[PDB]
Amino acid sequence: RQAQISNITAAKAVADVIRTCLGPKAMLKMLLDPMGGLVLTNDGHAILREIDVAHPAAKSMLELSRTQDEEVGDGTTTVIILAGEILAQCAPYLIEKNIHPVIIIQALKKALTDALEVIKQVSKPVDVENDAAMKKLIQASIGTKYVIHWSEKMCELALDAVKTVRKDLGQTVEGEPNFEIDIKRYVRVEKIPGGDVLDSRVLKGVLLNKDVVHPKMSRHIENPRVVLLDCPLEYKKGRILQIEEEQVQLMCEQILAVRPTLVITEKGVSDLAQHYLLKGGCSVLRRVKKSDNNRIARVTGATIVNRVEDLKESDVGTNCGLFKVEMIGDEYFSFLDKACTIMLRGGSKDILNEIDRNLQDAMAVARNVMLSPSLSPGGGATEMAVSVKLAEKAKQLEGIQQWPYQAVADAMECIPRTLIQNAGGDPIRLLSQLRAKHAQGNFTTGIDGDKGKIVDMVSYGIWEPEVIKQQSVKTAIESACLLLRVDDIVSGV
Amino acid sequence: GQIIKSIAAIRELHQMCLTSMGPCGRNKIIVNHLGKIIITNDAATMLRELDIVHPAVKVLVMATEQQKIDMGDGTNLVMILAGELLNVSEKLISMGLSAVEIIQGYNMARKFTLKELDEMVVGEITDKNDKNELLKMIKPVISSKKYGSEDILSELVSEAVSHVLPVAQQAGEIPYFNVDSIRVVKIMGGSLSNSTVIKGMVFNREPEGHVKSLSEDKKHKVAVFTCPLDIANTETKGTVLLHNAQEMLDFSKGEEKQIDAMMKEIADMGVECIVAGAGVGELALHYLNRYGILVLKVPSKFELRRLCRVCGATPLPRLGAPTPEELGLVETVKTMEIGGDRVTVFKQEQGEISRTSTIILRGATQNNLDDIERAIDDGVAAVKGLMKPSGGKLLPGAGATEIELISRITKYGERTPGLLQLAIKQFAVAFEVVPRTLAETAGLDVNEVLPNLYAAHNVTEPGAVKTDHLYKGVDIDGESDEGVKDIREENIYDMLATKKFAINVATEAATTVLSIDQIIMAKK
Amino acid sequence: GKGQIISNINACVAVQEALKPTLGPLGSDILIVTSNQKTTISNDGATILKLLDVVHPAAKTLVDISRAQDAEVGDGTTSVTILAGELMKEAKPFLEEGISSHLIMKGYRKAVSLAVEKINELAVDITSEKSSGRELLERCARTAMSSKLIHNNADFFVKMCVDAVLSLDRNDLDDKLIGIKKIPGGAMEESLFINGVAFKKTFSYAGFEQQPKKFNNPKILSLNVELELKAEKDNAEVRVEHVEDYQAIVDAEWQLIFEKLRQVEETGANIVLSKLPIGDLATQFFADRNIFCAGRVSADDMNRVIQAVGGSIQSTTSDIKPEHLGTCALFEEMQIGSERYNLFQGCPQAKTCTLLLRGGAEQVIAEVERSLHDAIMIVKRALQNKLIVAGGGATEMEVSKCLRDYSKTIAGKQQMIINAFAKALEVIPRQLCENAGFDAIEILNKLRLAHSKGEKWYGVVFETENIGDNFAKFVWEPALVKINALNSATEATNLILSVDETITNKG
Amino acid sequence: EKISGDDIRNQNVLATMAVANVVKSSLGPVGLDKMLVDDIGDFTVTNDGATILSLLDVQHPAGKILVELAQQQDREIGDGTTSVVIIASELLKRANELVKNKIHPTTIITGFRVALREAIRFINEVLSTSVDTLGKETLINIAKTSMSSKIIGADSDFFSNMVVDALLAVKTQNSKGEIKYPVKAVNVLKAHGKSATESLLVPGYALNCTVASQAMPKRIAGGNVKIACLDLNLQKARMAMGVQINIREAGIVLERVKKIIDAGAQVVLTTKGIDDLCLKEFVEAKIMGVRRCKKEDLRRIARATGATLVSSMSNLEGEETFESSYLGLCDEVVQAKFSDDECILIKGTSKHSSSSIILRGANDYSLDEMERSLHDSLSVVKRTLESGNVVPGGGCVEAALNIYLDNFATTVGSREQLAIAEFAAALLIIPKTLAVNAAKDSSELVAKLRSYHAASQMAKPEDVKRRSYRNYGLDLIRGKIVDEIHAGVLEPTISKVKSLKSALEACVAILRIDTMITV
């Protein structure tokens, strides 16, 4: 039983620090570094990352926060408090009451299913095609930030970025894709220095920063022909200049058989091959990455070919609008316009770095709406509404599975409790009236963060997507069953 | 958290009472300062020999005397219930709820609990005082103290109660069933099967006189004389002194004519028995044996007090005045051999109903025989709760009452608005210690009998009254068995005077502890 | 908590460990030194536990239950404690596994209830079948005397042992009624039996060569006061100036002594016994009348004289009644042992007797006297109780055998509890083989071989190491011992395991 | 330092106690795992007891014997290493208790070797080959508990009978009469046509592929048909796609077609497809062509139909289809309307001993999970039926050897009787630790299970009985005594044979050490 206590002690001591980090009114934290520095930021991600821990239970919460941030952009402290309170509420049952841990784990599996059903009942429908409705959603990650002034332009960049990746289809044959969108590879932003944020547009295609091998080239091509290749064009290896100039010309003549208007070489391009393809009316781009060829083949359609003599006749330049050598910001660009490219602009490098983390968290809220047209009330409304429904279902729950079940109902009230403690109101008086409010009034009545008195969400909606509530409850049960599964501690190799 | 540390000190005493209540409980060894080993189930002896300093435990000791003096049962019910109320209150003290509003929550829940106790009454005794009717009250009292004697001691105790309790109704002026009305004696040898019930006080002195027993005549007149048997002298001093041998002949012959003249009038009045509370002379035994008067001597003044409540005799400080108002009546006086020693007993047949009886106990081991005497003595005061002050009603026992009160109190918790709902909900949770106590002592699994017990009390009845099971108790068996028994099978129930009075004492005991936020002491 | 229960386990084993070498007739003896500075060595568990005075409350329970065993029965006080404390060790590993102590105690009462039923089945009532009247008690006495230094002389010892029991009423028999006086020196086979009572003869005073030891029917009279001239403490202070009065006060003090002295002659009793020393004055006047007197007699021997000839003790010599006198058939004073010993013979009303023992040393005779007490209890209980059971490993191994088969039909924790109680019964035959020098490892395994062949009477031979039947060894035990031992050991064990906490108050 | 006497015997028990306590909580499927932290600060967690013992740091040299025991156990059986350590733990605890009894450890070791040889002969007199495989399937409970976490678990009652009966007919002679169950078989397909309740069992391998033209008949050559597996397409051959033509190929691909119809093969499988010119030519010959065949499918068909998959045929500049050389024997090839499904049913052939299962469900999202869940399910069934003799688990062997060796110890009656009695009771720790992680009371289910084997084994040696059922195990989910034969929990017998043999070799080496010298 000594290791079971350490799992509770190590998990609570780390989670207790970030209990005050939840909400817009969250209090600041001070972390003194051994080198003499301090951390003034209240973000739970930057605090616990710099805190060195010993017991492995704290390291499990660090990897859980990194995985949770890849799904949702906000609500990092919500998952830690919810997953840490369930273990804290099971402390008297597992230790004092001598309840077997598998009985608790078995009860958390059935409580996870009922928890997801209550969220779907209190959820409200939302139109994903309405551009005006999506502005009030992303606004949760907009306000109290530098992007509040450009929010009108920021929402246009966030919505138009996921429209290219998303695919809307359904049927009973191939199933439902559930609107799978990849923000990482396709929606990856590209920060270009200079320009203006108002001029930032969503570019559909791929972008490359490498310049053109020749200074003077055609600024636009009517029908661009894209040809992809692997092996570079150079004199091969087993009076001399006559053979070297002829060998390169023969390798370039095979490409000119179809007379392409553009030449793309994966490896470097020698100076001998640049003069032969210059008079042919085609641009040559040296040093093209291999990972880009997969994305370039989608915006173009050129088949990947290794040897220069293996080029297939099926290669065409279709599905390419224009080719622009135009220079923006003293840097030569290339415009080849399921995958778009986000072009970010600003007045300095510090502006681009701030928009980066802000736009990623802005699109994470819009992405969660695409997984399903449902929203949940914030400010502790959904957290308390579930706890009220958990106590009503206990009438059929008689048997040993009922005792660990009560630890979940008290854990759902911990999220609104931390907001009241940071608000300054009486936590006993407000939580008692809030729990009785759901038993009579509607489930949509939450708690205001600025005031701290029970109010209806009709005034200020603060509508969070269901994915935030889903992943918070799902990962909390998995984290609770993770520490309860390990009853022993053994060190050494 | 000094108020929390005061609860931790009671927690050490709380675990002591968990092994007390119940037939599967444990007995504690009490070593007296005189070097005597004392082992008993009743915990009032432990708290009496142990002086308490800290107030939180001392209030529980004073609360034990409140339950012990007024009733012979429920001493463990108050100590366990009041100790759990402070344990469940640690969650409210931690959250920041002040101990002032915690007391207000128990006061509102106490009135709601006492109101539901009147609806928990199923059956009621008709006060018939039948041999079979007295078994239902005494059987749960013998339990939780001595195991295996429950069926044996049921018929022995119920026989003596009906002899000392008259049959009357609608009269509350004259009190009945005094504490001293039942005496219990023990002797080495034999067994519990050979034990008998005597209708009067048994005297252990031997019949030194030549008259062993009286005749078969009805209503033998008995006389209780405090003055010793000798020649009539002055009540104040009057010590006979010896001077010369010539006066010795007058002293011997003087006592012969005076005693024979005074005892002749006593035998003519019909008095065949004389009780002498002091020493008896040699010449007194000569005249009483020729007239057929049985000589009985009782040097102990404690036994003469209970004798006056049987035959109605009164002790006479002087000698030679046979007042008829001071004379008693006895049906039969004989001499029986109890435990190998022949002693003169006191009993009667079909007349002059006696208010004092004596139960003769027999056992192989003297150590365990003394514990049986204490279990029966504790069972006497339990009968006192059957009188007019709500002694006819009864509540289901064996843990059946504490489980039903959970669904009743928790229903009013969410219904009553305000901050009092936190203490009301936790007030019903504290009742879970009673079923868990019987489960830990009986070796049953707390993860099986306890959770399945709530499923028996929770049913769906197409009506406005929950019914069809009043009988669900807690299993006291020591052998593995599927399910639990019923209350009707063993007729194990709790009295109304025991349950209702224990609630008011338990609430006031935990209130004083929560009311103390600090202590003030001075140098001795 | 659980710490107090574990502390009580080692307390019961410590008391049990001291009684293990004392189990059995051949077992070792324990040395106990009382605060009285008196050396006491005995193998009887009663006297052992009474002289220890253990302050531990649970260890005192094992002492208190031994007194109850000595009261009802009186035999087996050592084995009842060993069996009671054995359950403490068997239940020790069960406490750490989480098994409640009440479930363990509950399984014992169900096993003992089934064990008592098997005792009546193994008890066969036999009296005149294949046995005679005289040879019945003689064959039982040679069993307890075997493997002893008296085995060669046991032929003459059984005749004196059987006659000592038959000399008393078969309805009421007591071991205290048979007196034993140790005589230092002499041959062991020359001992004789005495019908009356004898004393130590501590009389140190001169006046010998008188009061002959050959009597016909002398009258016995009890003496109280002192008949010698000079008193022990007080005296008479007389101040006279006359020379003739100095001799008068000498006879004046003697005249008051001769008053009660002459009244003894008026009674006409040749035997005078007194708890106080009789000086040379009384024995000188009694020499001419052939009247014997002996002083400094123990109080325990005076009570046997009253029960012998039906005498009485009177304070003075005046009011002595004639019916208080008594007489024997023959009085002979034996010089055996370099000391003269008075004895009575031929008392028909005597409720007690005396058996004289002779040997090479006092320490050798002390082992013979105690080895005889074990044989007397077997001879005494033979006529009292007709239900006997086979002992010496016979019954002990079968009670544990049946509980193993009955546990297979029982489900739950009580299955291993009865098996633990059946295993706890193996300590009784173990210590018997260890205290006898035999190997306990081999005999325990070899005995279980024939024990499973269907015969329940196979015991353990105490003479030569081997397995066999005790029926031919003439090892008999009454049924009341085996029944009360299982009940007393279980009752004492149930009280020890029921103590969660030990509270001790100083003052 | 040098330690001798009984002091080292107590240190060897305490050293192996902490090592054995590591795997006691991980035994059984209900067991729990733990994390192993190194000096760097990293860690890992796994439910396998062999991985934990491999990374376990044992400082005492006495506990290092169990470390080498885990490596030797994995090289042979590879499973059951967790249970081996627990068995050797109780053997050391009971042997140390006999030290106070003045029993020499060699006699204790000798008694364990005699009881081991008798336990081997006892296994052959109880167990036997798999029975009751007709009219019922006991293996249905293995796949049901594995798929209970998926939607298929609801309908798994009907699907379990299809999987168990499948592998029953998959067993073939392999190479020279092996009679074994292969690890690759029963091609799984998907059907979106109807609900999962309507899933039908196909008697043989069903190839998933489409046709080219609807003019050809879907059923031809019912009596016998020869399937010819091909790789390169029948389309006009191309030289290169990178060379420009500035100014035979059809006659080469058409010449091999002449060798097809003349060979009598009515089934042509081409991985790269078939042109339209070679299509109509097959219509007049009633040959059913298939375009874009799967390469992984034809390699299994070649071994099933007796053909040989060849990418290109040359044979010294020769051109032909190798008539009758690659042509296999297939009884019938029929194509029927599957109600929104299209597959090629291959029923009979020379020698196949194969089977197939086509799964049907609501959508493709559910069918993707049904195929992955069937792989991990049947894989346990493959390893279960791989051994010719199987034993039920749940503590049946440990309880049977406890009662059997109890009466067998009477054959000596001198010394080994005390060692055999402790060796038989030492196996009771295995069923006891299973109830600890199952939340059930260990003193109940283990004790009640012993009472059932007591009366059941009385009439077994007498060869006369009325109703006797052995193999009573432990049910961890429901906490009750059930028959493992009807439950269907099986274990390879070679495990326990090598488990009890290896566990003793590690226990003997520990009891034979009376001195430890550490320099």
XYZ file of all heavy atoms in Angstrom, chain D residues 398-429:
240
model
N -2.727 -27.621 -10.232
C -2.212 -27.438 -8.879
C -3.109 -28.096 -7.838
O -2.614 -28.586 -6.817
C -2.051 -25.948 -8.576
C -0.994 -25.245 -9.418
C -1.510 -24.816 -10.780
O -2.681 -25.113 -11.096
O -0.743 -24.181 -11.533
N -4.421 -28.117 -8.073
C -5.332 -28.759 -7.133
C -5.327 -30.275 -7.291
O -5.441 -31.005 -6.300
C -6.747 -28.210 -7.313
N -5.200 -30.765 -8.527
C -5.187 -32.206 -8.752
C -3.933 -32.847 -8.171
O -3.999 -33.936 -7.590
C -5.300 -32.506 -10.246
N -2.781 -32.187 -8.316
C -1.543 -32.726 -7.768
C -1.490 -32.627 -6.249
O -0.719 -33.359 -5.621
C -0.340 -32.006 -8.378
C -0.131 -32.191 -9.883
C 1.019 -31.328 -10.377
C 0.112 -33.655 -10.216
N -2.290 -31.744 -5.647
C -2.301 -31.632 -4.193
C -2.961 -32.846 -3.550
O -2.460 -33.376 -2.551
C -3.013 -30.348 -3.771
C -2.856 -30.053 -2.292
O -1.853 -30.415 -1.678
N -3.851 -29.392 -1.712
N -4.084 -33.299 -4.107
C -4.781 -34.453 -3.550
C -4.097 -35.751 -3.968
O -4.016 -36.703 -3.184
C -6.261 -34.425 -3.971
C -6.957 -33.197 -3.381
C -6.975 -35.694 -3.530
C -8.346 -32.959 -3.930
N -3.587 -35.806 -5.201
C -2.969 -37.031 -5.697
C -1.690 -37.356 -4.933
O -1.479 -38.501 -4.517
C -2.687 -36.906 -7.195
C -1.967 -38.096 -7.788
C -2.646 -39.274 -8.067
C -0.609 -38.039 -8.072
C -1.991 -40.365 -8.609
C 0.054 -39.124 -8.613
C -0.642 -40.284 -8.880
O 0.014 -41.366 -9.421
N -0.823 -36.360 -4.738
C 0.415 -36.583 -4.002
C 0.190 -36.759 -2.507
O 1.118 -37.176 -1.805
C 1.389 -35.430 -4.245
C 1.910 -35.272 -5.675
C 2.766 -34.022 -5.801
C 2.691 -36.507 -6.101
N -1.007 -36.452 -2.002
C -1.287 -36.657 -0.585
C -1.329 -38.141 -0.247
O -0.714 -38.584 0.730
C -2.605 -35.978 -0.208
C -2.940 -36.134 1.263
O -2.213 -35.565 2.103
O -3.930 -36.827 1.577
N -2.050 -38.928 -1.048
C -2.097 -40.369 -0.830
C -0.846 -41.065 -1.352
O -0.499 -42.149 -0.870
C -3.342 -40.962 -1.494
C -4.624 -40.547 -0.799
O -4.619 -40.196 0.380
N -5.732 -40.586 -1.530
N -0.162 -40.464 -2.329
C 1.059 -41.055 -2.860
C 2.217 -40.975 -1.875
O 3.140 -41.793 -1.954
C 1.440 -40.374 -4.178
C 2.724 -40.877 -4.775
C 2.754 -42.068 -5.481
C 3.899 -40.156 -4.637
C 3.933 -42.534 -6.033
C 5.081 -40.616 -5.186
C 5.098 -41.806 -5.885
N 2.187 -40.017 -0.945
C 3.254 -39.898 0.041
C 3.276 -41.067 1.017
O 4.276 -41.251 1.720
C 3.118 -38.583 0.808
N 2.204 -41.857 1.077
C 2.153 -43.015 1.959
C 2.943 -44.203 1.426
O 3.091 -45.198 2.145
C 0.699 -43.438 2.192
O 0.084 -43.755 0.938
C -0.079 -42.316 2.864
N 3.450 -44.130 0.194
C 4.227 -45.233 -0.360
C 5.589 -45.375 0.305
O 6.187 -46.454 0.238
C 4.407 -45.050 -1.868
O 5.072 -43.806 -2.125
C 3.056 -45.052 -2.571
N 6.090 -44.319 0.943
C 7.377 -44.368 1.629
C 7.136 -44.546 3.121
O 7.483 -45.583 3.700
C 8.210 -43.105 1.349
C 9.502 -43.132 2.150
C 8.499 -42.979 -0.139
N 6.541 -43.537 3.754
C 6.242 -43.621 5.169
C 7.432 -43.475 6.085
O 7.379 -43.935 7.228
N 8.510 -42.848 5.618
C 9.706 -42.680 6.434
C 10.161 -41.227 6.450
O 10.148 -40.575 7.498
C 10.831 -43.583 5.924
O 12.015 -43.401 6.683
N 10.564 -40.714 5.288
C 11.138 -39.379 5.192
C 10.406 -38.537 4.154
O 9.834 -37.492 4.484
C 12.627 -39.463 4.851
C 13.480 -40.067 5.953
C 14.915 -40.272 5.495
N 15.006 -41.236 4.403
C 16.143 -41.598 3.819
N 17.292 -41.075 4.221
N 16.131 -42.483 2.831
N 10.433 -38.983 2.895
C 9.873 -38.207 1.791
C 8.396 -37.878 1.976
O 7.891 -36.974 1.303
C 10.069 -38.960 0.473
C 11.522 -39.119 0.058
C 11.678 -39.922 -1.218
O 10.673 -40.500 -1.684
O 12.804 -39.976 -1.754
N 7.690 -38.594 2.859
C 6.279 -38.299 3.088
C 6.081 -36.862 3.558
O 5.110 -36.202 3.170
C 5.693 -39.279 4.105
C 4.195 -39.119 4.318
C 3.615 -40.180 5.232
O 4.314 -41.099 5.657
N 2.328 -40.058 5.538
N 6.994 -36.359 4.392
C 6.893 -34.975 4.843
C 7.261 -33.996 3.735
O 6.745 -32.873 3.706
C 7.784 -34.753 6.065
C 7.412 -35.539 7.324
C 8.447 -35.322 8.417
C 6.024 -35.153 7.810
N 8.145 -34.399 2.819
C 8.531 -33.521 1.720
C 7.469 -33.490 0.627
O 7.210 -32.432 0.041
C 9.877 -33.960 1.144
N 6.848 -34.636 0.340
C 5.812 -34.681 -0.687
C 4.570 -33.925 -0.226
O 3.900 -33.260 -1.025
C 5.490 -36.143 -1.052
C 6.707 -36.809 -1.698
C 4.294 -36.218 -1.989
C 6.560 -38.304 -1.878
N 4.250 -34.007 1.068
C 3.089 -33.292 1.589
C 3.270 -31.785 1.472
O 2.315 -31.058 1.173
C 2.834 -33.693 3.042
N 4.489 -31.294 1.702
C 4.757 -29.869 1.548
C 4.891 -29.471 0.085
O 4.586 -28.327 -0.271
C 6.022 -29.483 2.315
C 5.911 -29.652 3.823
C 4.785 -28.830 4.421
O 4.581 -27.682 3.975
O 4.104 -29.335 5.339
N 5.342 -30.391 -0.772
C 5.452 -30.083 -2.194
C 4.079 -29.994 -2.847
O 3.861 -29.165 -3.738
C 6.314 -31.136 -2.893
C 6.435 -30.935 -4.377
C 7.321 -30.004 -4.893
C 5.670 -31.684 -5.256
C 7.437 -29.818 -6.258
C 5.781 -31.502 -6.622
C 6.666 -30.569 -7.123
N 3.141 -30.841 -2.419
C 1.796 -30.801 -2.984
C 1.044 -29.557 -2.531
O 0.309 -28.948 -3.317
C 1.028 -32.065 -2.600
N 1.214 -29.164 -1.267
C 0.556 -27.969 -0.754
C 1.207 -26.684 -1.247
O 0.591 -25.616 -1.148
C 0.548 -27.987 0.775
N 2.431 -26.760 -1.775
C 3.103 -25.567 -2.275
C 2.485 -25.052 -3.567
O 2.633 -23.865 -3.880
C 4.590 -25.851 -2.489
N 1.797 -25.910 -4.321
C 1.167 -25.495 -5.567
C -0.107 -24.690 -5.350
O -0.627 -24.115 -6.314
C 0.859 -26.719 -6.432
C 2.065 -27.523 -6.922
C 1.613 -28.773 -7.660
C 2.958 -26.666 -7.805
N -0.618 -24.629 -4.119
C -1.840 -23.885 -3.840
C -1.640 -22.376 -3.893
O -2.626 -21.636 -3.800
C -2.394 -24.283 -2.471
C -2.850 -25.735 -2.321
C -3.260 -26.025 -0.885
C -3.990 -26.044 -3.281
N -0.401 -21.903 -4.036
C -0.164 -20.466 -4.098
C -0.567 -19.900 -5.457
O -0.888 -18.711 -5.566
C 1.309 -20.158 -3.767
C 1.521 -18.654 -3.576
C 2.232 -20.703 -4.849
C 0.791 -18.080 -2.382
